[PDB]
Paper text:
Following endocytosis, HAs undergo conformational rearrangements due to the low pH of the endosome, leading to membrane fusion.
The full length mature HA1/HA2 trimer crystal structures are as follows: (1) A/Fort Monmouth/1/1947 solved at 2.95 Å resolution, (2) A/Jiangsu/ALS1/2011 solved at 2.35 Å resolution, (3) A/Almaty/32/1998 solved at 2.05 Å resolution, (4) A/Hickox/JY2/1940 solved at 1.95 Å resolution, (5) A/Netherlands/002P1/1951 solved at 2.5 Å resolution, and (6) A/Melbourne/1/1946 solved at 2.55 Å resolution. Our other IVA HA structures all contain an insertion near the C05 Fab CDR3 binding site that appears to prevent antibody binding, via either insertion of an Asn which becomes glycosylated to physically block C05 binding, or insertion of an Arg, Lys, or Ile into the C05 binding pocket. Although the insertion of either a glycosylated residue observed in the electron density of our structures (A/Netherlands/002P1/1951 and A/Fort Monmouth/1/1947) or of a bulky side chain which partially changes the loop conformation (A/Jiangsu/ALSI/2011, A/Almaty/32/1998, A/Hickox/JY2/1940, and A/Melbourne/1/1946) appears consistent with the loss of C05 antibody Fab binding by analytical SEC, rigorous mutational analysis and quantitative binding experiments would be required to prove these are evasion mechanisms. Interestingly, these insertions do not affect the identity or the positioning of the sialic acid binding residues, allowing these strains to bind the cell surface receptors while eliminating nearby potential antibody recognition sites.
Numbering used by the authors:
A (entry chain A): 4 to 324, 330 to 359, 363 to 492
B (entry chain C): 4 to 324, 330 to 359, 363 to 466, 469 to 482, 486 to 492
C (entry chain B): 2 to 324, 330 to 359, 363 to 486
């Protein structure tokens, strides 16, 4: 008596299918990465720039609270934290701030340099009194490290004129401010001239600022305001500053080097000496799976983020220790006793064997099925959040509509692919067992009684020799009938 | 003679499959909601705010045509109509109007309050002559209810300085205007001083305005212009207004409560005393279907909008009153006489029965298949159109490219899924019938003749026919 | 020794497709879904030629930059072509305010009429109209200027308050351009416009802007320390625009009455114009295809297949070519019959004296015809989709626009490549099914009268001639 049957094991792997959920299967692959090291890591060997208690504004202006960032020159990405609260210390408006954050997100390294050396650039103006209790440091009134708040020298503020020629071979980021006093008494005290102007021109930047005197609510005990400005000076170009008051002059500028794959993320994780190909605000990922459910914000080469809790793909068959009627059908159960293949035979004679041809073709096909569908899935490169000022609610909502829309498409695509192809993987195995069985019934013909549960009760007695004949596809029906 | 066959009924339900269109099937479910009550309803018990003939500007400024909106304090969504034509009655520019619309789209309730009480805040200026024929009410010249057009008092306009401290614990929306007269005679008549300014400053707002005198084409017979401005004053912050002319001063402001799920829609439907979980400009939807084709604009929890006319999913089989060769194959037709199941047996002996095991496993799987794909579809929360001014065409087109891209993908996903899985569901039934038949062929073996159309050498009564549903040797 | 056999088609095809279980599967018949061929040329759309800006860009064309004189008599087009040499824009340095928006507005203009809105010869009697030239806009070795603007200057040391209005009686929206000049010095301001403090005012019923010229020492661009800010507005039909100035006005000279169409746009291409008509135009060349997908270029004009990032989308229709789930094809029926030319599934007889089965074969064609059609319909054609432009303070919006384009393209490429992978398996299964059903159809007829070898052949236990073979194939046995 020869029987035909399929594999069973001690596996608890569950997948879901179109017709049935919580289907226990013999073998499966996880497609969804849910593990991370909970740390900030280097990316391709380059550590990120950690702004800590500072935000982008405080770093680029040189807020005294951020002095430890002053020597930073190259990074792989930028990390803000939940306590990145130090930006502008003196009240005002940072014009096109979010655009500057976008500019700095593709900066891989920069050279901070003294664009107008303090001790020699301003002989006719005071360079020593531009400090405020709003930018305190070490118990004293102080000021930004990258700006120089010029004031009158000996009751005079002559027309100032200073130029810089960009000989760096790179774009130079130039920052300045215009100070808006709270009274004309303050205007006279700081700059002498009551009717001031500031002009900033380059070959592609051209703005004139007229300071406004006004009574304002005090912010950090300050009724004045500084508006902060920035521009990118192209290589070879000149930028010209002219003023008779109220100029918060550039002191340090940045020659920028552009790179690929950087971005600004907000994380509470701590920096460790790890190296990763993929970084999230939650931690680093080490995986080749096509999907992750850890965070939508990613730095590097990452799996696509999806809103799923499980994405298990069946590769083996139903674990029983059907569209084609064999598995869980007329062959009621599986054989844990057969460990060496997915499909096989069981011989019971006087004197368990798995079929290698059918099992190796199934193994080949399922491997191509897993590989071919993961291939259609593409690596997620750097994708981060974006910031918008309080008059850009429509754009902010448009950006959120775009990100949520794609995330819903990819989550639907992923969950539905697995659900529908899991059911086709079980039908594939059921088909393989039904084809192996029928190939044995066309080989024995009249020489055996079909019991109907995958077994052929032999009428004659042939020992092991002809039993391998049945399996090998070399069984001689005439000799025994 | 015992036969194996499948169910048929008087159903005309049609589906489309990958290999054949217009396939009549025994049972199906519609996945596409196309019905609505044609009314505006409450959402979670809260009525919408109906602006009627007014648009957002006329309402929030207090255009005299909108007096009936003045007491409105809480709403679930905002309805403009095709006749929402009353906005600014005196001509000019409403600066960052579309942004204000976006801001108000997330307001669930507000408190309208007098930020500068008219009779006590302006002792040195006139509060009684700032009316215009462009904002007529009751046959007389009038003005906005939330603005106060100050003018000179006794031939002088002293420098004015007024401040408001937000003690409301909420953002306060403050609106004001700057008037730009058409001539210097008009400037002197209204404000005396020829060179005027308006300054409005807070802790995070800081703007100064110089009125501009120019000859302009008349709009509503007005050659002057008013620029309307707004800002959100944070809790605890102070806003200071300073001017020596041309100030349309704030009179009423709004303490705002933010909420989730609101929006502004344009509808011609009328309000009724219904409550709904889902509202569109055409009418409210009461459905659990994953899709609708009624409107892309939705308020609440709604089915996903798709551009399809039909999304019917086959649950039963082909209606005959195959991949596996049985249904519409060697079993050429179905049995209307069998009413109690999808697959069953028919006996003709000397002395119709549905199989419960095979039919209930088909029902269990088909139920899971419909439920499993409807879960993959997630409810649509509030999604409404947006507005852009005439220098934001690129942004407007980008918004339209985004909205169109998503709808083309979803319409494709839904239409293709139903098309492919319909063929797949009918194959499932063909497999169940071919598996039912083969289970019988191996039980009867040589004791019966297989006619080959799904259909006894001995004479076997009713008792033994249920045996199969069979001790072959015992009754051989 | 009389045998009917059941088989399937074979031919000499090298057509190859990919399947979810196997790659490089050679099939008998397949259809390409992916247009990769174009003519390499720019062509008319609906018989209307594009506007080739050539060495000029939108700014230089619309202002009338003298390098662009040859575009002046162009009145209608089907789309606008910039080239990689489209570098002539503003010739006098300055800022073209809201330029990208203006490009976006012209993308929808099908034709326009250029006309003297303020005729030079008669609109400015109290001002000079002949001295507003510069070496920055050189023409023919001489100082010249934009063809559509007029640089008004002082007349005999008098530049009086100027005021001119235009009432749009054209029935279409009118595009009006002007400039405001910002001189380098206080002397330049007096030398050109006399009055020290000047202003420009431009008001319509929906437009109200004022300009105050700013004098500042500036780096020279094209030998000019001054700057001009260029401006534009659309005057609605019946609306009136009014210019008032006391200097610094670069006045509108020619304006444009626009006709809006559908489906135009601006593309960058380096292909040459050729005398051809096309429903579909891309920067690389024109497409003539009914296929649903193309991989030529994402920019298109007209009605085009949808762009995907794919190198091959071939969809099997015929059979596995051998000269499955169901066990017949490449199963117990091991190989195919090149000798059965007129059908997908048929019979072979060995009598004493190949045949296609019409019924099962013509049903499989109808099914396969319907599958490929049903899939092509779900795909919709690409209407005009073009790139957008953004100035240097719109980097976030530029990226957001790219995240959108990149997002959709990835999704449609995934959709097309997964649809063909998965449905190619289903089609091969379908063919293994049709063969098996036919082979079991024959088996149930013969029952006891024939021995089943198991390779699709039935050796009939009686004698069976050409008449009895037709019985088996006809089903009349
Ligand atoms: C748009 O279409 C035109 C049409 O052909 C196309 O033109 C090509 O331009 C390139 C570059 O401008 C040409 O290139 C050269 O070929 C000559 C021989 O004719 C060489 O001598 C040149 O070499 C010199 O210069 C280099 C730069 O310094 C040096 O590195 C080099 O050692 C040489 O000194 C140069 O290779 C080319 O001839 C034409 N034509 C063709 C058919 O290529 C243009 O490129 C297209 N534009 C775009 C943006 O695609
Ligand atoms: C489960 O199977 C693995 C591999 O056969 C074996 O190493 C392990 O001991 C088994 N455990 C149990 C509890 O059966
Ligand atoms: C799923 O099946 C497992 C067997 O692997 C069982 O232990 C578990 O309770 C089941 N859970 C559900 C939710 O069906
Ligand atoms: C971030 O980590 C620090 C370290 O303990 C802790 O003070 C803070 O609560 C954390 N914040 C969040 C949001 O996890
Ligand atoms: C990532 O995981 C693999 C899994 O075996 C491991 O071999 C490899 O060392 C891991 N990489 C890092 C950087 O830890
Ligand atoms: C069709 O059959 C259903 C069975 O539920 C019955 O209710 C209905 O009345 C029938 N149609 C007609 C026209 O009688
Ligand atoms: C669908 O079939 C019915 C009858 O089978 C027919 O009356 C109807 O016209 C068909 N539908 C279409 C759109 O042709
Ligand atoms: C709404 O639908 C529910 C079921 O979801 C139904 O019970 C109820 O009658 C319907 N009511 C209205 C007003 O449509
Ligand atoms: C197959 O034979 C036909 C018959 O002439 C021929 O036209 C065709 O080119 C051949 N196949 C290939 C790939 O050339
Ligand atoms: C694919 O199969 C063809 C036969 O049709 C063969 O010539 C070729 O080398 C194979 N491999 C490819 C195309 O990479
Ligand atoms: C497009 O291709 C068809 C197919 O040969 C051809 O007949 C037609 O002339 C072509 N049309 C153009 C405009 O090239
Ligand atoms: K800002
Ligand atoms: Na506006």
């Amino acid at each position: 008596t020869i029987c035909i049957g399929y594999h069973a094991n001690n596996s608890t792997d569950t997948v879901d299918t179109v017709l049935e959920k919580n289907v226990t299967v013999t073998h499966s692959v996880n497609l969804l990465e849910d593990s991370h090291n909970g740390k900030l890591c280097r990316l391709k060997g380059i550590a990120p720039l950690q702004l800590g208690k500072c935000n982008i504004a405080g770093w680029i202006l040189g807020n005294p609270e951020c002095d430890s960032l002053l020597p930073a020159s190259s990074w792989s990405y930028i990390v803000e934290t939940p306590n990145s609260k130090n930006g502008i210390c003196y009240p005002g408006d940072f014009i096109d701030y979010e655009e500057l954050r976008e500019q700095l997100s593709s900066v891989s390294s920069f050279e901070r340099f003294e664009i107008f050396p303090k001790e020699s650039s301003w002989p006719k103006h005071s360079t020593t009194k531009g400090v405020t209790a709003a930018c305190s440091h070490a118990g004293k009134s102080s000021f930004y490290r990258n700006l120089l708040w010029l004031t009158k020298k000996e009751d005079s503020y002559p027309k100032l004129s200073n130029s810089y020629v960009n000989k760096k071979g790179k774009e130079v980021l130039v920052l300045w401010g215009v100070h808006h006093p709270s009274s004309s008494k303050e205007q006279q005290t700081l700059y002498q001239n009551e009717n001031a102007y500031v002009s900033v021109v380059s070959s592609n930047y051209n703005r004139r600022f007229i300071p406004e005197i006004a009574e304002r609510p005090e912010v950090k005990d300050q009724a004045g305001r500084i508006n902060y400005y920035w521009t990118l000076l192209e290589p070879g170009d000149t930028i010209i500053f002219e003023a008779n008051g109220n100029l918060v002059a550039p002191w340090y500028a940045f020659a920028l080097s552009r790179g690929f794959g950087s971005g600004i993320i907000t994380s509470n994780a701590s920096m460790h000496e790890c190296n990763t190909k993929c970084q999230t605000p939650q931690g680093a990922i080490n995986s080749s799976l096509p999907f992750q459910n850890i965070h939508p914000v990613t730095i590097g080469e990452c799996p696509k983020y999806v809103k799923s809790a499980k994405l298990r793909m069946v590769t083996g068959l139903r674990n029983i220790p059907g569209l084609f009627g064999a598995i869980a059908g007329f062959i009621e159960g599986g054989w844990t006793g057969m460990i060496d293949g997915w499909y096989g035979y069981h011989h019971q004679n006087e004197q368990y064997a798995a079929d290698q041809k059918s099992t190796q073709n199934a193994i080949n096909g399922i491997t191509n099925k897993v590989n071919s569908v993961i291939e259609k899935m593409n690596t997620q490169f750097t994708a981060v959040g974006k910031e918008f000022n309080n008059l850009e609610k429509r754009m902010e909502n448009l950006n959120k509509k775009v990100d949520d829309g794609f995330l819903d498409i990819w989550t639907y695509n992923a969950e539905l692919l697995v659900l529908l192809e899991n059911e086709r993987t079980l039908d594939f195995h059921d088909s393989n067992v039904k084809n192996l069985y029928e190939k044995v019934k066309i080989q024995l013909k009249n020489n055996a009684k079909e019991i109907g549960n995958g077994c052929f009760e032999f009428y004659h007695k042939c020992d092991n020799e002809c039993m391998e004949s049945v399996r090998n596809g070399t069984y001689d029906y005439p000799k025994y009938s």
